[PDB]
Design a binder for this molecule. Structure first.
Ligand SMILES: [Zn+2]
Lengths: 206, 140, 60, 155, 127, 98
RNA sequence: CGUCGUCAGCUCGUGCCGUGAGGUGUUGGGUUAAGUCCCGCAACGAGCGCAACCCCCGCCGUUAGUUGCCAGCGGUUCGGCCGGGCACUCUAACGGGACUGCCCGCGAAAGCGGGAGGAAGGAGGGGACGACGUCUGGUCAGCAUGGCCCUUACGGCCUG
RNA sequence: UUCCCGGGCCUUGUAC
């Protein structure tokens, strides 16, 4: 067992870093800490919006945050007021005139994190696990997506014994570098403990 | 020397009962053949090209001639009904008339149109097949 | 990794030598690196998640 | 090895003499990977041979080599939890191996203070047919051919 | 006029300059024998010379950097081989079979975690 | 007489930035020294993959910094104003020293 | 995260056999590091696997010459020290190159033995990479979390 | 490759 992170395996090629900036040893730690704090706040807030990715850029004493959301309607609001207060929040947190940006993800069925949170919510709502997994994999397969794989951790249906479910279809070549496999993990909290869901989606090559 | 297809290397088990699956291989061979004659081959470094060359060679050896069949055939011509018993069974199962150049060790009942002759003796096969193809060409 | 222990490290302890380093993510004080200010587990997790600019898997 | 034949490494022939046996000898003298020291020991030894004994020490070295070269070896065999020291033929490669090995250990075995004089004395004596290496070879030979009754175990 | 060869072996790099002369070799502005003083393998540098009836025709200027003495000698060897090749191509026909125009490419293997040094596992007993 | 320092984590964006600067300067009259590659600096971090034990796991990570040099010669005033104005990519870091 | 184990195996679609459980594929001969590949064979494929794609070392080339280098020039208070130059080493980026590719011979083929050209010759030498699963494996003391337990104490602050 | 240790594949007797 003990498969490695599919994203960390492809940082060099076919995948790109979430945080894109340079800093010396003198100030690496501070920037990293503030970046982590920003990510924490944003993930805590915008969960309802269907968060996908948070990109952090720095050019010169300024931050350019990009947020990938399924539905920008939630984040922006009725006439672009919500974002404003959101901006202010970040502006209050770290006083370097951040510039928030929102991007909408095309066909949300082809984003592993979104599938992950969807399945997690289904689990949290006491759904049937196996049926939900088949539905999810089929839904992913409908929209191109040359491969799909979904794994659920354990403690299925409040049972006394934990067990992995697992289901996949298509091609999921985890061993090839030129794969561009999108990965997503979600955690579901229920009355009988925590469950982990993983989703891999395979989209073309080269 | 005719439009008719042929199988002359080895009868892959299921060319008729599993025609769709073999048609998948026909499609694959077509796609490879197209790819090698395309100016997009500069990707896929030399070793992968060599692997694809091996694959293409294999599919060419085995599936050549069969490529002509866009669908199920209308009849089958077999040199030896016993050596090619599998093909006979498939044709029988799919209501495809069978023509055989049988010999002393064959089953007449399994062939609709039988030519009692020789299976060895290159001369005999040459004569029979030449006459048959000439009749094919003449009647077009 | 008690909470009280976490806040105890964020005050000047009347002398220099009592000061030390804790992980800024989990409050571990056993495998923290000066460069990042993270424990080895958190470092590995964040590196795999691709949230460390320029940090990549090494092979040579 | 279970498949291959473990190809023999071809040693680089010595510089002064243009010979491979000398290279093998100096390699066998080696400890802790000090080539220069071993070569110096060998050269000093051969110079001592030259001064003491008239003729070129290359020939005396070679002659000692085929002097202390055996032909029979006894090997253990495990049949029904018993030992069967069957005699067996040695390939020239194996011959050379044990010859050089015995020569070097015998050289190290002498009670003389300096290594060079020890190896020189052992070399000259082995050429003559006396010393530790020679006596050990007749030891192994007499251990062999004494249990010829075991020869049926071809192995 | 400049007959040049590179020469590299086990992290050592050389630069050799052969010019017509009486057969004087100098490295780092110093005599060959003095530089490799006491090294029995020093003469293992210039057998490429004697292979082709040289050693009487060519004065050599050698600038060599990096690696150890044995690596130094090997780099010099390959350098002179390449320079002699540059002199006249035909020499190749008699140099290649003797094993002088190949670049030896075995270096120190990387030390591996879980081992003492790249191969040696820590000792364990009392199974 | 003006030296231009380019530091980065990604070599591709660094090369792109250096190319942009060199091209813009070359267009702007006087000649330049050209992109001088410098030896990259490597930091290494070996960790235990496991959270509790198995000290024989030891996954590796590296952080490498790539360096450039431009060294514009015979500075022009309009060349100078051309600099400090062109927006640089996010990842790349710039430095100016006479 | 460790181990079996970087062992080579674990399955599916369609088609054939059997009334059915099921079987074939995945067995047999040979060969590989390998379920790698060939032939035979009622099967033809495909997925996770192996291999490859990625990184380093080894040869060469094109952009690039400062803090790197100094072959051919002029000085030098002789140390690249200056004037001077990117020839060479290097430094980094992008490529080329190795593919049983050519020849002889042996085999029905995969292949085998021996040559040549090459820096390298028959997975060139290492790295990253761990399949379906087993071990009620390890970790509630990195962290996260279900249920019990304590809250003038099993909480917290100092000295030793 | 006889034997010691640990594996893989193919063959045979008694229980789920
Ligand atoms: Zn931590």
């Amino acid at each position: 067992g003990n498969k490695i992170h599919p994203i960390g395996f492809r940082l060099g090629i076919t995948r790109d870093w979430e945080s894109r900036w340079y800093a010396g040893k003198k100030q690496y730690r501070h920037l990293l800490l503030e970046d982590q704090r920003i990510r924490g706040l944003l993930e805590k807030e915008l969960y309802s919006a269907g968060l996908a990715r948070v990109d952090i850029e720095r050019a010169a004493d300024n931050v350019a945050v990009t947020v990938h959301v399924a539905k920008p309607g939630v984040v922006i609001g009725r006439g672009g007021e919500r974002i404003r207060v959101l901006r202010e929040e970040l502006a209050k947190l770290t006083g370097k005139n951040v510039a928030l940006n929102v991007q909408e993800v095309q066909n949300p069925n082809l984003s592993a994190p979104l599938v992950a949170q969807r399945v997690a919510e289904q689990i949290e709502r006491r759904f049937a696990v196996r049926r939900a997994i088949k539905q999810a994999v089929q839904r992913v397969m409908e929209s191109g997506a040359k491969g799909a794989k979904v794994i659920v951790s354990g403690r299925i249906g409040g049972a006394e014994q934990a067990r992995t479910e697992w289901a996949a279809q298509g091609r999921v070549p985890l061993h090839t570098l030129r794969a561009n496999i999108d990965y997503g993990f979600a955690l579901a909290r229920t009355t009988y403990g925590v469950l982990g869901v993983k989703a891999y989606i395979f989209l073309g090559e080269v | 020397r005719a439009g008719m297809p042929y199988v002359n290397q080895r009868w892959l088990g299921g060319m008729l009962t599993n025609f769709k699956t073999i048609s998948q291989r026909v499609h694959r061979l077509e796609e490879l053949e197209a790819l090698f004659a395309s100016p997009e081959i500069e990707e896929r470094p030399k070793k992968e090209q060599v692997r694809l060359k091996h694959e293409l060679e294999r599919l060419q050896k085995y599936l050549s001639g069969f490529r002509l069949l866009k669908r199920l055939p209308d009849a089958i011509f077999v040199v030896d009904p016993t050596k090619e018993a599998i093909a006979v069974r498939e044709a029988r199962k799919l209501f495809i008339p069978v023509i055989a150049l049988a010999d002393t060790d064959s089953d007449p009942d399994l062939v609709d149109y039988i030519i009692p002759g020789n299976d060895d003796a290159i001369r005999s096969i040459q004569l029979i097949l030449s006459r048959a193809v000439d009749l094919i060409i003449q009647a077009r | 990794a008690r909470k009280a222990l976490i806040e105890k490290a964020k005050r000047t302890p009347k002398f220099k030598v009592r000061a030390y380093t804790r992980c800024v993510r989990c409050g571990r004080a056993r495998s923290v690196y000066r460069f990042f200010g993270l424990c080895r587990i958190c470092l590995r997790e964040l590196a795999h998640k691709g949230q460390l600019p320029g940090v990549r898997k090494a092979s040579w | 090895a279970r498949r291959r034949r473990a190809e023999v490494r071809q040693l680089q022939p010595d510089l002064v003499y243009g010979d491979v046996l000398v290279t093998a000898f100096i390699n066998k003298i080696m400890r802790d990977g000090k080539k220069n020291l071993a070569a110096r020991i060998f050269y000093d030894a051969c110079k001592i041979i030259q001064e003491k004994t008239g003729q070129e020490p290359l020939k005396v070295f070679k002659q000692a080599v085929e002097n202390v070269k055996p032909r029979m070896e006894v090997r253990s065999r495990r049949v029904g939890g018993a030992n069967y020291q069957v005699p067996m033929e040695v390939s020239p490669r194996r011959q050379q191996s044990l010859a050089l090995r015995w020569l070097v250990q015998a050289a190290n075995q002498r009670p003389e203070r300096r290594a060079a004089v020890r190896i020189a004395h052992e070399l000259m004596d082995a050429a003559e047919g006396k010393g530790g290496a020679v006596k050990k070879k007749e030891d192994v030979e007499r251990m062999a051919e004494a249990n010829r009754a075991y020869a049926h175990y071809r192995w | 006029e400049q007959y040049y060869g590179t020469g590299r072996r086990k992290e050592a790099v050389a630069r050799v300059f052969l010019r017509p002369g009486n057969g004087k070799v100098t490295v780092n502005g110093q005599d060959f024998n003095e530089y490799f003083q006491g090294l029995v393998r020093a003469v293992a540098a210039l057998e490429p010379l004697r292979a082709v009836d040289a050693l009487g025709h060519f004065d050599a200027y050698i600038t060599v950097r990096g690696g150890g003495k044995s690596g130094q000698i090997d780099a010099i060897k390959l350098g002179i081989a390449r320079a002699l090749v540059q002199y006249n191509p035909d020499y190749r026909a008699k140099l290649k079979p003797l094993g002088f125009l190949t670049r030896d490419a075995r270096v120190v293997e990387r030390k591996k975690y879980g081992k003492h040094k790249a191969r040696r596992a820590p000792q364990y007993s009392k199974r | 007489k003006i030296r231009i320092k380019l530091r980065g984590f990604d070599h591709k964006t660094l090369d792109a930035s250096a190319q942009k600067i060199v091209e813009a300067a070359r267009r702007s009259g006087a000649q330049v020294s050209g992109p001088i590659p410098l030896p990259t600096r490597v930091r290494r971090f070996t960790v235990i993959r496991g959270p509790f034990k198995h000290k024989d796991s030891r996954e590796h990570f590296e952080l490498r910094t790539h360096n450039r040099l431009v060294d514009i010669i015979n500075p022009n005033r309009k060349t100078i104003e051309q600099l400090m104005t062109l927006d640089l990519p996010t990842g790349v870091e710039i430095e100016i020293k006479t």
